[PDB]
């Protein structure tokens, strides 16, 4: 079991990176989709006001 835990620490150190990539990608993809739509709507709103 001690040898399994030496190897298991390295697996958990990798899962911490996989979990950081999956969480940041999901959060960034949603936030950037709102920022793009809000920029398009804002540049459009300047012309509509004109």
């Amino acid at each position: 079991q001690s040898e399994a835990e030496k190897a298991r620490k390295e697996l958990l150190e990798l899962e911490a990176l996989s979990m950081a990539v999956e969480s940041t990608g999901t959060a960034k993809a949603e936030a950037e989709s709102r920022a793009e739509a809000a920029r398009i709507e804002g540049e459009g709103s300047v012309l509509q006001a004109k």
Binding site: G42, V46, Q48, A49
Partner: protein
């Protein structure tokens, strides 16, 4: 972007309000002249009588 849209609506609305005010003052001054002219003539009728 909102600051640009607000500046456009600001100048567009203030161009309208300025022209409305310029005409309302020209008219209210003319309507005043008429009210005074009425009061001066009708007051003279009563003084003569």
């Amino acid at each position: 972007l909102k600051a640009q849209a607000l500046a456009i609506e600001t100048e567009a609305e203030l161009q309208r309000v300025q022209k409305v005010r310029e005409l309302e003052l020209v008219y209210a001054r003319a309507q005043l002249e008429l009210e005074v002219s009425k009061a001066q003539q009708l007051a003279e009728v009563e003084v003569k009588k």
